[PDB]
């Protein structure tokens, strides 16, 4: 839960950065369905097989 | 950290221009680690700079 900060840089313009992290610190990621990816990567195999 | 297994980011401090060209003030802003590069050729731990 990052929070924006406003830092002024000379006349008429601002620089934005992370000011503080609310809550606890954790890790970003990507989740993918497991058996669907397994099936998909085997399905790519049955088509890719023919030119190898 | 004792290998916290969650990237901590680096909390940095630097000088910025206030509403007058001549007076300056200390500021701080958390930055993601990959964008921050150490500066010294020696083994200094204190000072850093942006990757650009």
């Amino acid at each position: 839960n990052n929070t924006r900060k406003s830092v002024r840089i000379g006349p008429g313009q601002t620089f934005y950065a992370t000011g503080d992290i609310i809550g606890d610190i954790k890790q970003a990621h990507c989740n993918i369905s497991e058996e669907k990816w397994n099936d998909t990567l085997q399905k790519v195999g049955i088509e890719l097989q023919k030119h190898f | 950290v004792k290998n916290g297994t969650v990237e901590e980011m680096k909390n940095c401090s630097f000088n910025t221009t206030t509403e007058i060209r001549d007076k300056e003030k200390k500021e701080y802003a958390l930055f993601y680690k990959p964008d921050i590069v150490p500066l010294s050729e020696t083994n200094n731990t204190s000072e850093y700079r942006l990757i650009n």
Partner: antibody
Amino acid sequence: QVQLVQSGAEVKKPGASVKVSCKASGYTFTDYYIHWVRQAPGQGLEWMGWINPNTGRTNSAQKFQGRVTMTRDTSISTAYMELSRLRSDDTAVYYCARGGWIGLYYDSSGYPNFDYWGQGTLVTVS
Amino acid sequence: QSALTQPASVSGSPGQSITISCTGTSYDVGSYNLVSWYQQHPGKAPKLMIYEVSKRPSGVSNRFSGSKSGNTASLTISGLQAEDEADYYCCSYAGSSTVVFGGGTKLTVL
């Protein structure tokens, strides 16, 4: 069997800082959030803060920020509750409780899922 | 003092049903499903009772229940017993990252 234990009944005098110690017995102290709860004697519960042992990161409630700061030492299975500039309005029992499960992902820091409680200590000041 | 409002006592006899109104607003109760109830016997440590709107731990019976309603979620007891004549305190997440309590609800069973 898992159990939460604390230092017994406490005696001080007003103004002095207090350091309440909480023992994590019979489970992984690295895998669960810990939460502190105040109970004024015979009154309702007031919430203080939490501590993450594996991370060491903490947050004290806005009512006590800059006055309460928790710490731990895994080698002795101890969680601490620091509390400075003690007013006599802090007359209360302090509890140590086991919160949600820690994960590298997900965020159970703020979940009210207090499973077990420590036997507490009544602080004597007036 | 609690930001959450909640009654201080509802009285009666065994076997009844109850509704005790822990109340919040958009910031704590409305936006989130993080609401809980805690039993508090006289002079005893609190006991977790209801967690995450309505789920129950072990050592806890189907004599008790609860459910969300907008900015108020309530404790619904059923089949009252004098043994459970305790205090009851609601509890809920309140944004930022904080935990809040409410009320003083002493059950009474004649």
